[PDB]
């Protein structure tokens, strides 16, 4: 019932009580741990509503008050009458902020409470969606001084009228499968890019083509929009010592903005809720650049450093990896685009865990995702036991829309 | 019930049926995953099912399930349990059991080698001098002048829990740590406690940075006894770097032979509380963890100083740079001295092949991602992108409490 987590570097022991509130399931059993798997009615709705409003009214220290009881009856009467309900602005902001607070895979949560929430529940068309998104992009980018934000389109109704952003990120690069046999640009986005072309996009067929938005409103067929180029801040990648690095033609965008997830607050489902923060360096340098199935540039870089690639044991991949990552961080810092390195981000998360344990009785965390994909054991999160459990409000995956949507 | 695991780099999808033969629990529930928790006297009643289950596995593997030899062995074990309250394994059952414990070790990336294991049966051992001799022979055979060979030595099983055989050392070869009055540590901070015990038991500590610890050996539940491994048997590698000539002047070396001596081997319900085993190192065990943990030799600062990295801002990745050069040095040193070692690229690639073969032939390969992914350069190794399923098969290696916490001192 009370659970302990030890840090094996500092011997610090923390007691988790928060997990008893856990309200969704993990995919694990006593017979099998699924910790490393990527993806494991009016009656239903009121408990969910109650559960959330109880926590909300607890947070403003008004639990069991008149205002609390009144709201609970209001929502009860709204559900029984309308089969759903609407969140007050204060509730909405709280729910979004907590969805991030509870994201067990997010290392950047020390920032959870500084989230700008843009209420787009009045949106009705894809064109409106595009306006709301451009404003989000520009507000968050902030000339390089990045600011966390989320924009929240209308909640699901009968699920025949969903709002969806088809892009997986607001800003991503196209991928085209070539007669050659290889892949030009980002191999992660072939299927979506093809979908764009099929809906009508004029693809330029470059390596770093910013994808168009594909926006679905009120269950309708989605439409294409190009984000004003002047709103998409990009960074050319150079190395502080290797002059030749720039000759790779590498760039990345400043704004990371996940657009394909579902926000669940008090039982209500917000299927279009793009949110953005700022990058940890390894996300681009290790994953985007080096993943065999991504831009996969290790071989090229190594050659330019003139390393012995005859034998795995010269650690040439590791040598090139560090340099690629040094360059990402240098390039962003020099251009004054907010970025954080894995040492600093994981140290911050450790301070955040301790705060959550002391002020909330715990912090759900998924070690598999929290430990950076390079230099794991020299960051403090490596040695930190973590308990992973599912709290609501939350962000959830949802099927890619082209699998669901009927045209 | 079938379970799928996907590789996100290759899209290879595998199907596990083997998790169905799982007995022991995980620590996880439907409501909480404990997959990153480090550490998540049997009756007759409990013993016979465990025996039967083991002997069923064994007779299947030799293609003799349900033979007369199979039924007779069951009945013979049956009686031995009913009459003596325990039982003895045949040599072949022990070999098989020790190999399977390794095969089943979900946190071990080196399992492609599981069927090549030299088993030394030390169940006739009765004294701590006896154990010492057994362990010297294991050390010599395993070392093999640098061409390392996997081996395990198996001392008599637990009886009433009052007569346990234990090796108090966590590894057969490890360096002393000495906490100084000024609060700093000389040698390996990981071994301070055990070092103190050794000194308390009467070891004369040389007090250097790399002193091989004496063996501390308990036989038959008796108080343990100190023995120095003959230095001629302790293969060491001095650490130097291929391009950086100042690296040797750091004064570093390490031992060639990784040999865990504090785990418990469980076979068919029987508990073997002293069962030291050894293989060979993956380079990152020394260069990432032994040298670079803040709680260990903690050499990252000194190395980066000497490389003249920019150390004012963590964002130079000075730590990451030093870490790679240290690990380059470790592998270069071992290879140059012809001591067996494997890098983390080669080991993880080998593990992925092992894992697919295991799915094809055994219907599964239980695997702990937290432990299998190397502690540097995780995502440019093929395990990072491999979904794994973690579950517990017997035979197995388990932890046990350190014996200085449980031992009843005789005097
Ligand atoms: C502000 C700085 C932020 C940093 C440094 C950061 C960092 C990260 C990183 C490194 C990951 C793992 C990424 C991967 O390997 O794909 C991640 C995942 C995640 N982040 Fe954060 N993030 C930030 C902002 C935000 C915000 C504003 C939100 C939501 C409002 C958010 C929600 C999430 C969620 C739900 C995941 C896991 C998603 C999944 O399971 O696929 N992050 N974050
Ligand atoms: C042949 C060369 C071997 C290699 C390269 C290898 C590699 C490794 C590594 C890197 C670890 C994780 C160690 C740590 O991070 O502390 C490990 C764990 C483990 N190894 Fe292997 N190993 C080898 C041989 C063996 C042998 C011979 C056995 C026993 C017969 C064995 C049984 C285990 C077990 C039970 C664990 C997990 C221990 C735990 O749960 O803490 N290994 N191995
Ligand atoms: C806000 C934010 C801040 C930050 N620094 N980085 C990101 C991008 C990393 C990220 C954050 C949250 C969710 C996802 C999607 C991960 C994913 C999902 C699926 C379905 N398949 C994958 N292979 C990967 N990616 C977003
Ligand atoms: C045969 C073998 C081959 C190889 N390449 N490496 C080793 C040494 C690594 C190892 C293998 C098995 C068990 C342990 C003990 C790990 C441990 C456990 C706890 C509870 N705390 C720790 N700090 C460390 N370490 C052994
Ligand atoms: C807290 C965490 O589970 C712990 O530090 C583990 C993580 N993964 C590991 N992996 C290996 N191979 N060895 C270890 O000691 C650890 N330590
Ligand atoms: C199989 C494994 O679960 C998968 O590779 C995960 C591992 N850890 C990760 N960690 C982060 N931060 N992001 C990822 O996409 C992944 N992929
Ligand atoms: Zn689990």
Swiss-Prot record, chain B:
Tissue: Isoform N-NOS-1 is expressed in brain and colorectum. Found in the Auerbach's plexus of the enteric nervous system. Isoform PNNOS is expressed in the penis, urethra, prostate, and skeletal muscle, and coexists with the cerebellar nnos in the pelvic plexus, bladder and liver, and is detectable in the cerebellum.
Post-translational note: Ubiquitinated; mediated by STUB1/CHIP in the presence of Hsp70 and Hsp40 (in vitro).
Result for mutant: residue 281 to H: 50% decrease of nitric-oxide synthase activity
Record: residues binding L-arginine: 171, 280-281, 285
Residue sites binding (6R)-L-erythro-5,6,7,8-tetrahydrobiopterin per the record: 36, 370-371, 384
Region forming the signal peptide: none
UniProt subcellular location: Cell membrane, Sarcolemma; Cell projection, Dendritic spine
Residues binding heme b: 108, 399
Record's function text: Produces nitric oxide (NO) which is a messenger molecule with diverse functions throughout the body. In the brain and peripheral nervous system, NO displays many properties of a neurotransmitter. Inhibitory transmitter for non-adrenergic and non-cholinergic nerves in the colorectum. Probably has nitrosylase activity and mediates cysteine S-nitrosylation of cytoplasmic target proteins such SRR. Inhibitory transmitter for non-adrenergic and non-cholinergic nerves in the colorectum.
Family: Belongs to the NOS family.
Subunit and partners: Homodimer. Interacts with DLG4 (via N-terminal tandem pair of PDZ domains); the interaction possibly being prevented by the association between NOS1 and CAPON. Forms a ternary complex with CAPON and RASD1. Forms a ternary complex with CAPON and SYN1. Interacts with ZDHHC23. Interacts with NOSIP; which may impair its synaptic location. Interacts with HTR4. Interacts with SLC6A4. Interacts with VAC14.
Domain remarks in the Swiss-Prot or TrEMBL record: The PDZ domain participates in protein-protein interaction, and is responsible for targeting nNos to synaptic membranes. Mediates interaction with VAC14.
Name of the protein described by the UniProt record: Nitric oxide synthase 1
Source organism of the structure: Rattus norvegicus
Taxonomic lineage from the root: Eukaryota, Metazoa, Chordata, Craniata, Vertebrata
Shown segment, full-protein numbering: 299 to 718 of 1429
């Amino acid at each position: 019932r009370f659970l302990k987590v030890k840090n094996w570097e500092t011997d610090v022991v923390l007691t988790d009580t928060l997990h008893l509130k856990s309200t969704l399931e993990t995919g694990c059993t006593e017979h099998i741990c699924m910790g490393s798997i990527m993806l494991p009615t009016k009656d239903q709705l009121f408990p969910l509503a109650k559960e959330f409003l109880d926590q909300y009214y607890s947070s403003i220290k008004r639990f069991g008050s008149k205002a609390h009881m009144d709201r609970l009856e209001e929502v009860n009467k709204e559900i029984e009458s309308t089969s759903t309900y609407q969140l007050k602005d204060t509730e909405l902001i709280y729910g979004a902020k907590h969805a991030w607070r509870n994201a067990s895979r997010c290392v950047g949560r020390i920032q959870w409470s500084k989230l700008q929430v843009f209420d787009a529940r009045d949106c009705t068309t894809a064109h409106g969606m595009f306006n709301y998104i451009c404003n989000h992009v520009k507000y968050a980018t902030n000339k390089g001084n990045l600011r966390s934000a989320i924009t929240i389109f209308p909640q699901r109704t009968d699920g025949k009228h969903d709002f969806r952003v088809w892009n997986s990120q607001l800003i991503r690069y196209a991928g085209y499968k070539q007669p050659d046999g290889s892949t030009l640009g980002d191999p992660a986005n072939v299927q979506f890019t093809e979908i764009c072309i099929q809906q009508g996009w004029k693809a330029p067929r470059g390596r770093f083509d910013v994808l168009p938005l594909l926006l679905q409103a009120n269950g309708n067929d989605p439409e294409l929009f190009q984000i004003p180029p002047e709103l998409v801040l990009e960074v050319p990648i150079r190395h502080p010592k290797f002059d030749w690095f720039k000759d790779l033609g590498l760039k990345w965008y400043g704004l990371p903005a996940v657009s394909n997830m579902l926000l669940e607050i008090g039982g209500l489902e917000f299927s279009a809720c793009p949110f953005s923060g700022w990058y940890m360096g390894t996300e681009i340098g290790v994953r985007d650049y080096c993943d065999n199935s991504r831009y996969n540039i290790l071989e090229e870089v190594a050659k330019k450093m003139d390393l012995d690639m005859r034998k795995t044991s010269s650690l040439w991949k590791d040598q090139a990896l560090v340099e690629i990552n040094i360059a990402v961080l240098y390039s962003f810092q020099s251009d004054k685009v907010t970025i954080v390195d894995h040492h600093s981000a994981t140290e911050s998360f450790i301070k955040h865990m301790e705060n959550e344990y002391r002020c909330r009785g715990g912090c759900p965390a998924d070690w598999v995702w929290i430990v950076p994909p390079m230099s794991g054991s020299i960051t403090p999160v490596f040695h930190q036991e973590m308990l992973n459990y599912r709290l609501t409000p939350s962000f959830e995956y949802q099927p890619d829309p082209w699998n669901t949507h009927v045209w």
